[PDB]
Design a protein around this ligand. Structure first.
Ligand SMILES: Nc1ncnc2c1ncn2[C@@H]1O[C@H](COP(=O)(O)OP(=O)(O)O)[C@@H](O)[C@H]1O
Ligand SMILES: Nc1ncnc2c1ncn2[C@@H]1O[C@H](COP(=O)(O)OP(=O)(O)O)[C@@H](O)[C@H]1O
Ligand SMILES: Nc1ncnc2c1ncn2[C@@H]1O[C@H](COP(=O)(O)OP(=O)(O)O)[C@@H](O)[C@H]1O
Ligand SMILES: Nc1ncnc2c1ncn2[C@@H]1O[C@H](COP(=O)(O)OP(=O)(O)O)[C@@H](O)[C@H]1O
Ligand SMILES: [Mg+2]
Ligand SMILES: [Mg+2]
Ligand SMILES: [Mg+2]
Lengths: 259, 46, 255, 256, 256, 253
């Protein structure tokens, strides 16, 4: 029950209202699934919910699906208490077991194991989990947290997600105001990042920027919603590296061949 | 490949060298005390 | 033993059907377009049977992992690798007469079937190198949220797998079919949600919402009813005004 | 200082270097659009000896040869005795990262899963592949480098938006092999001298200007030490640098 | 004297010998354009006895008859307290040879991942020993030969073309069976003396112009192992040193 | 043994084969589906001065290469580390005589290499506690069926191929001799009849004999045996001379 607003910045679009609805959700602990641009408000939203998780709620058990190799992903999945799986020793409790009450920080990675998918379905089954050789089921608890970045209904029509992947998933949806869409705190969060950037640069004075830069900023797509711009901003800071020295351009697409 | 632990690789222990190590970890003053208290019955042990 | 019954002649019909199946312990599998409380179904069945005193505790079949089906069928092995030495017995034996819903059957694997079937059709507890097999006549039944006869057309399973169920697979009506007490059913879902939302009470929804409930495709049949119910609740969070709108396609993005 | 070796008289080599210098205190990612047999490694060195934490770790582990899918999980970690057959994670790379940066070669092949796992690293970086161990972060910076066509990857979608973005913070185009032609003559002689010395070849053959012209004709896209490789070839062509230099070897497959 | 195994009186063989003499002390990487059967494992141990360290030996055994795990898991060996399944500090045969020379074989069989690892070693030389540790280097020559056209294989995009150069100090061809023609008469005589000694056949009973023509027509698929093996089959056909050699078992595996 | 080498190319072939038998040169042989290679090898071994020599015939597929040499070598360990004495040793087991290899054609190259040149010195034949030493057993492998293109398929270790014997055991089909047919046939028949404890060989009608005379009979001696057996149970009685050339228990008929 505190601020912990952190660098949650640039919500002058209805992403403010997005946050508001997020708040409306925040008390309830039921399954969380969202949607939006990767590396862009998204995991920041994750932090947002992690704050929405009571500070005393528990371990923000981060779930990063692009990992897990192939198999004993299963181990930490169902668990591993027996021998011959995870160095034996104690019942190794999986990251799934690691969360007891914690965040099911489900990441929408679109990796191949719908095998995994069914597993997590049983992960979201009755509040329960059972290890490798896991001689007994154990009725488990954890906060549940997913999000998205692509057309889940299409993949359903594409069959790509387990139908029940979504069926069990997403009590409701939560999207993001795209960089082609949000477009409101442009100069605002622009300056915020710039402040951080100069401060790290310890740049003696805020360069300032010409309006041609902001005109481009409106013109820019910013496909990566939050960071790509932010990276661009820091990049302007670098490619300039001058204090009080007003900008007139920005650095984003170094793939643009030099002149 | 698919890693883990797999079966591969018993009998009866005795405290013989174990009692010997009990002597060695014990100090040579009392270790010789036992050494005497040992060699007494061993008639071929001077 | 007790759940959000579908309160319906098709539902009460499947009820009487399972009731005909009640003390019966012969093998089985489930028919059903989706699941419609697939777990809850087998679960109430479990709560009923002579395995009521028996272990009415399931196991998720096609969960399992590659190399260890032996143990899976038969619990932890004494002689598998050096570490363990105790012939910990079948999850089946962990019931061995209780009620252990063979769920996840559709997603199961090929040689996995090759063993589990043959054993179930015939095989006492022949574990890893053991002395003597013991038959754990464990209350037998599986399930199919999918179409096995289709799988037969595919031929993925054993025709023995076809033999597996000793019972005819009851099915529940599609949501498009069932759609029976969804008024009262949703009302209960809402009483639930308001309790979960700690909401004071429900004045109601639109009768337009009622018709949209009628005018509902309803794929996530047993889920989505109460699902989008409470979804409408929270996206509303409002009890003073009727749920004139309900949370239709969360997949849909509003304008 | 990278011995100041690999001299690029292309003042763009210098300009790159200046960008490097600006980047030197800087601590954020960077791509080096390298070349086939170019030598992004050596320049990355020249950077590291100049790193803001130049005293920091400087490891070269690329997953280009990631024949094992599990060589990854390792590189992401291992629980002590994870799986089994082992004692602890061989964490050397994870070691260099804390108190260091990240350097890789030819990031093209990465399992997309591996890649976005790296993604969950870069923004936050948990103790990973650790068999359920609690998270942990390596005070890790980064640097990137390849000869691949980034647009080709983008079409391939090879880098995710989160990936392509948060992965990338600077772009260092290695000049084309022939781009740095005056630099070519420069570092060419640099090698010529370096060879004549270390070979202890009693005399230095020098260089035939015709050989120089022929060498310049070598598009020689590979020149990393591929310059040095063809150089050793030519040295053997001379065999001994006692005589003045004319015997220049480029293509060694040829019998006779 | 290394017994002058395959004493090639051929001027091509003579020049091959002269050049092998030139560069075997050059304990450096080089390219053997060579194949099995044609000097199958013929020159390596000579150049090892000709290696800079005559005290230094020839481990080699880097034949690529191994497919997937064993090839590498013996290559680096592996770690002691960590592996797929063995607590063996397999130091790898790279550790094995101290002082002398070693060769990599069937190099075409290698994967690209192995290709980059090895070419790196050819550059890097330090290595963390598969499992991962403080890397360490050895100072010695590098040797390999492949029967294929790696210019095309890299044109086929299959291997460390970086290896295909850094090793490729000079692609060193050697004579095939089809290469040996006039000295083939002498080679027949020498293998015959060797066999008559070994087979306890009294001596060379004599050549048959008919057998001579039969062998001359024999296109000789294999080069050397074929020579000895067909000699064995034909001797078994004859089994005596009285009648002049005509029983030529050109196909010891001819049917019926 | 009843070779009945009535091909009589079988005869001179046997002449050369036993000629090699006293010699202990390595053995690599190609055998017909029904060649009775065992008998040939057995005959050579008894003909070898390893008449009494050890003759471990390695049906080389049942193992685990996860203990490949651990069989091929074995391990010596005793006392508190492990109960028993020590391993017999695969190279150690056949030591002093025939070293017969079977189940070789479709084998893992784990074995192929693990044996490859493994005896060229041989002094490295007992490890993991098993105590290394060199040995002398007449190396034998046989039943060769892989085409030379299998060596061109390379899966046949051409290293083993050069490591193979100086030539190959040529083998013809049962369609070839067609000679001791009635003979060894009756040999089998009476053999069964006694094994059947049967009354007596009722005989064979020439109709069966003719139907037989037309057969490639790939199963060679096995074909002979099996055909005899099928027709034998088919007669089910020994009254009159049988009449059926029992081809195959396949047709529903
Ligand atoms: N207000 C902001 N200003 C500048 N950059 C931001 C801001 N918010 C987020 N970012 C950048 O967006 C990047 C990706 O964040 P995010 O989308 O949450 O990652 P994920 O893919 O894990 O969701 C981060 O690296 C961060 O630097
Ligand atoms: N007859 C029923 N009574 C009460 N709840 C039910 C009933 N049928 C289904 N459910 C609900 O459905 C959920 C189970 O979903 P299920 O149909 O098993 O998913 P799937 O179709 O993917 O197997 C449970 O949470 C349960 O509350
Ligand atoms: N500026 C330079 N100075 C010295 N050597 C270089 C330079 N650039 C490239 N090389 C040589 O190229 C060989 C491989 O170089 P390079 O291609 O940079 O590595 P990578 O293959 O990672 O790009 C290295 O061993 C190095 O000696
Ligand atoms: N001359 C023969 N005398 C007796 N039995 C024979 C004869 N030739 C073949 N056989 C029979 O044919 C079978 C051939 O077996 P085998 O040599 O193992 O075949 P393969 O070499 O294809 O494995 C033997 O079991 C044997 O009983
Ligand atoms: Mg994320
Ligand atoms: Mg389901
Ligand atoms: Mg490179």
């Amino acid at each position: 029950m505190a601020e912990y607003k952190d660098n949650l910045l640039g919500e002058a679009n209805s992403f403010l209202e997005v946050l508001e609805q997020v708040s409306h959700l925040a008390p309830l602990d039921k399954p969380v699934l969202i949607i939006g641009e990767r590396g862009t408000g998204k995991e920041l939203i994750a932090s947002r919910l992690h704050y929405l998780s009571s500070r005393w709620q528990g371990p923000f058990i981060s779930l990063n699906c692009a990992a897990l190799n192939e198999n004993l992903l299963d181990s930490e999945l169902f668990g591993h208490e027996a021998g011959a799986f995870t160095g034996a020793q104690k019942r190794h409790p999986g990251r799934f077991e690691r969360a007891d009450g914690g965040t099911l920080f489900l990441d929408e990675l679109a990796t191949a194991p719908m095998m995994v998918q069914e597993k997590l379905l049983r992960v979201i089954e009755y509040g329960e989990l059972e290890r490798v050789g896991g001689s007994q089921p154990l009725q488990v608890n954890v906060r549940l947290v997913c999000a998205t970045n692509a057309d889940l209904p299409a993949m359903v029509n594409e069959g790509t997600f387990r139908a029940d992947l979504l069926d069990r998933l997403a009590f409701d949806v939560v999207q993001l105001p795209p960089l082609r869409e949000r477009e409101s705190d442009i100069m605002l969060m622009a300056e915020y990042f710039a402040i951080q950037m100069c401060r790290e640069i310890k740049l003696p004075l805020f360069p300032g920027f010409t309006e041609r830069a902001r005109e481009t900023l409106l013109n820019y797509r910013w496909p990566g919603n939050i960071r790509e711009l932010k990276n661009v901003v820091e990049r302007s800071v670098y490619r300039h590296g001058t204090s009080d020295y007003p900008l007139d351009d920005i650095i984003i697409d170094p793939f643009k061949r030099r002149p | 490949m698919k890693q883990g632990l797999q079966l591969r690789l018993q009998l009866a222990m005795t405290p013989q060298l174990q009692q010997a190590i009990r002597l060695l970890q014990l100090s040579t003053l009392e270790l010789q005390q036992e050494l005497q208290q040992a060699l007494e019955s061993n008639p071929l042990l001077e």
